[PDB]
């Protein structure tokens, strides 16, 4: 097998390659003076199953993935398999107003045209998997998150909204903990929040889990609500830590700690999903 | 017909739309907090021939084109026709080393998959045309450049290297002028230049023409050479004025004026290709 490690995913891809006892093949990569992207893979990938590892979220990341898909065509490879730890544009998986792109659709179509398989970790909404002509697998960071928190004192696992439920139910089951979610709504400028079930959080230690942290607004608000109700400790976890200015400070206003995975590498990437990806590769 | 004017081509697209008595339809466009691109075309495009005008060279331009090609699928259109006044990645039209992308190939395949036709103005190397499943037309700024310089005192039209020869031959003939080209080559750290034919440029007014000005090294050097040999005026034109790294100033050290087209809009964009694109649009109909 050959593991290609793209710029966005050097850390995770390296962890993966080492575990698999194989080279993390990186491109030679630079920008031409006019700003166009240049890539080169001088290693002979002929006859190998190739696993390209890189996020598909920024303009640059998309260009890096597309041009990689072209570069590898120089070789008669056994198969080409895309693994995008964080899959970009998953949030635009339908048209929400007329004349909008279904961004995740056209992009998945493109990737699927040039590969034999696609996989990502905890895609936002699985609708997008249906846009691929090749098998598109949704991998899960659950076990890695459970591994981390087995050595932490936790009373409840909590979803910040009424949508992150399945993940929180699975994670809590594996930790042997109870769980609940927070339903937040705005009714005429004023905010209303319901705990379901209506758990007493007074003096309790809470692990809040979500899939993505962007602006952090969603998790920051719920953390503040729970702190207000007497939570003794709040841990914040997400799979994909984007942390756009200035999410970390909003969250840490009321939460004690932030721990995300290495799908998107940051100072808070304390939980690696390498094992989950290796399983997929081993079986693919 | 509906003309869609993308961010990179607002000036040219607007000129085209106005010439054709139609709206230059712009997207509502913005970046989400995480940096992902949002576009929206609220106009009803159903039943129309659509012409999407935008360059395809920057990362953002590529995303703009791709997401536009998805957004317009919300409507039952008659046809979708891409016009990229400047076509990105045309310079990488083969693998020059093992394991390089053929960037112009994969990108052309993508655009072709979501359109009924593609056009650009003066592609760098027509090899890339063959990468498209749909008809990929190479329009030319020649007549526009001619129309500008028929009112300029010019003695010779000149190619900066021995490759943009057909264009310079066509332009000089339409101006009723002679032409030559400069062969520059490096031989053991020294640079050797030959004029072909070996024209005496002393006291002569020269129009240098290329397809793209990027770093402008070749043109700046040639201008210096020609100036040293006694040229009285040097005009520099190119279809695509990218102007990276101070190139325009490097060139103006020895050239008198720079005039480029509006394929890439800058303060040097004095020659519009709107008529050439309108003629193409008229042919494809609507
Ligand atoms: N990268 C991004 N960042 C922020 N918002 C985005 C985004 N991409 C798309 N969006 C917007 O986010 C909104 C998502 O719609 P919502 O109704 O809030 C959730 P949904 O997509 O219906 O269900 P889901 O979140 O369970 O998949 C849309 O308006 C979409 O345009
Ligand atoms: N945007 C860009 N800017 C600068 N150089 C680029 C580029 N994209 C690709 N290149 C490089 O430019 C080189 C072009 O190859 P050359 O041998 O100089 C001319 P050619 O492409 O063979 O003929 P042509 O210029 O007549 O098309 C390649 O090494 C390619 O990798």
From Swiss-Prot, chain A:
Cellular localisation: Cytoplasm
Signal peptide: none
Residues reported to bind ATP: 34-36, 91-93
Top-level taxon: Archaea
Reactions listed under catalytic activity: D-ribose 5-phosphate + ATP = 5-phospho-alpha-D-ribose 1-diphosphate + AMP + H(+)
Complex formation: Homodimer.
One GO biological process term: purine nucleotide biosynthetic process
Listed pathway(s): Metabolic intermediate biosynthesis; 5-phospho-alpha-D-ribose 1-diphosphate biosynthesis; 5-phospho-alpha-D-ribose 1-diphosphate from D-ribose 5-phosphate (route I): step 1/1
Cofactor(s) demanded: Mg(2+)
PANTHER family in alphabetical order: RIBOSE-PHOSPHATE DIPHOSPHOKINASE FAMILY MEMBER, RIBOSE-PHOSPHATE PYROPHOSPHOKINASE 2
GO molecular function terms noted in the UniProt entry: ATP binding; kinase activity; magnesium ion binding; ribose phosphate diphosphokinase activity
Active site: 184
Protein name: Ribose-phosphate pyrophosphokinase
KW Transcription (keyword) present: no
Function: Involved in the biosynthesis of the central metabolite phospho-alpha-D-ribosyl-1-pyrophosphate (PRPP) via the transfer of pyrophosphoryl group from ATP to 1-hydroxyl of ribose-5-phosphate (Rib-5-P).
A single Gene Ontology CC term: cytoplasm
Note describing how the cofactor binds: Binds 2 Mg(2+) ions per subunit.
Organism: Thermoplasma volcanium (strain ATCC 51530 / DSM 4299 / JCM 9571 / NBRC 15438 / GSS1)
Gene name of the encoded protein: prs
Main location: cytoplasm
Family annotation (Pfam families): Pribosyltran, Pribosyltran_N
Documented EC number(s): 2.7.6.1
Amino-acid biosynthesis among keywords: no
Annotated positions binding Mg(2+) 2: 161
Chain residues that bind D-ribose 5-phosphate: 186, 210, 214-218
CDD domains xrefs: PRTases_typeI (cd06223)
Keyword terms: ATP-binding, Cytoplasm, Kinase, Magnesium, Metal-binding, Nucleotide biosynthesis, Nucleotide-binding, Transferase
